[PDB]
């Protein structure tokens, strides 16, 4: 299972950058490079000088998008043209399963779409599998300068997964929670306190 993990985050509402973020005496980017140093997986870093800032740190895979794109979908583009299929995760959500990601990847593969998102009255797509028959349709959004996601969705084969499917791997579906404002800090140290 290939894996990307998009840490290019800069941490607006929380006043610094999320892989620097705090979590029970963790940085955030050591968070996700713990849970997902098992898979085949690469971290997509905003830009270079992030991922040369960062692997002078950790040996690990650090990519970026080739032609300076900003955003989540250039993330995502980055990751497809790098090693092709696989599932995202953005850092913003630490607690991701495994379980759960494991699942996303193994369904969107043999479901034949161009991505699989979970989906309960609205989708998350930063925790979705995509195939790299949608790489395309990201790219033209990016050179075309759309920062929506669901706009070049809409061109696309897209599975809609109901995230109620997922409970059984993640019982209170807490892969995701995700970490933008001052609240989530808070209930973010509770929720990996209690773990
Ligand atoms: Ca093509
Ligand atoms: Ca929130």
Redesign the pocket.
């Known amino acids: 299972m290939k894996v990307a993990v998009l840490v290019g985050g800069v941490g607006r509402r929380i006043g610094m950058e999320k892989t620097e973020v705090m979590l029970c005496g963790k940085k955030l980017i050591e968070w996700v490079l713990e849970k997902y140093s098992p898979f085949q997986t690469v971290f997509v870093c905003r830009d270079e000088k992030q991922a040369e800032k960062l692997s002078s740190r950790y040996e690990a895979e650090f990519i970026w998008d080739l032609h300076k794109g900003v955003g989540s979908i250039a993330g995502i583009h980055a990751a497809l043209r790098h090693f092709g299929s696989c599932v995202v995760a953005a850092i913003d959500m630490p607690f991701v399963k495994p379980e759960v990601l494991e699942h996303l990847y193994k369904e969107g593969e043999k479901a034949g779409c161009d991505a699989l998102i979970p989906k309960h009255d609205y989708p998350e797509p930063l925790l979705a599998y995509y195939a790299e028959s949608a790489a395309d349709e990201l790219e033209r959004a990016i050179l075309q300068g759309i920062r929506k996601i669901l706009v070049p969705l809409e061109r696309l084969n897209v599975v809609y997964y109901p995230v109620e499917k997922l409970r059984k791997f993640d019982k209170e579906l807490i892969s995701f929670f995700?970490?933008?404002?001052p609240?989530?800090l808070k209930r973010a140290e509770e929720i990996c306190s209690k773990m």
């Open positions: 995700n970490i933008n404002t609240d989530d």
